[PDB]
Amino acid sequence: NCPYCVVYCCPPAYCQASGCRPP
């Protein structure tokens, strides 16, 4: 299950203030 952020994003990654970014 991926984290529910401003935009449907999945790992590998990290949800930060800017949003979902790559590894």
From Swiss-Prot:
GO terms for molecular function: toxin activity. GO terms for cellular component: extracellular region. Expressed by the venom duct. Keywords: Disulfide bond, Hydroxylation, Secreted, Toxin. It is found in: Secreted. Disulfide bonds join 2-10, 5-15, 9-20. The modification 4-hydroxyproline is found at residue 12. It comes from the Eukaryota. The cysteine framework is VI/VII (C-C-CC-C-C). Belongs to the conotoxin U superfamily. Negative results: Does not affect sodium channels Nav1.2/SCN2A, Nav1.7/SCN9A and Nav1.8/SCN10A, acetylcholine receptors alpha-3/CHRNA3 and alpha-7/CHRNA7, calcium channels Cav1.3/CACNA1D and Cav2.2/CACNA1B. Does not impact cell proliferation. This is Conotoxin Tx6.5. The lineage of its organism: Eukaryota, Metazoa, Spiralia, Lophotrochozoa, Mollusca.
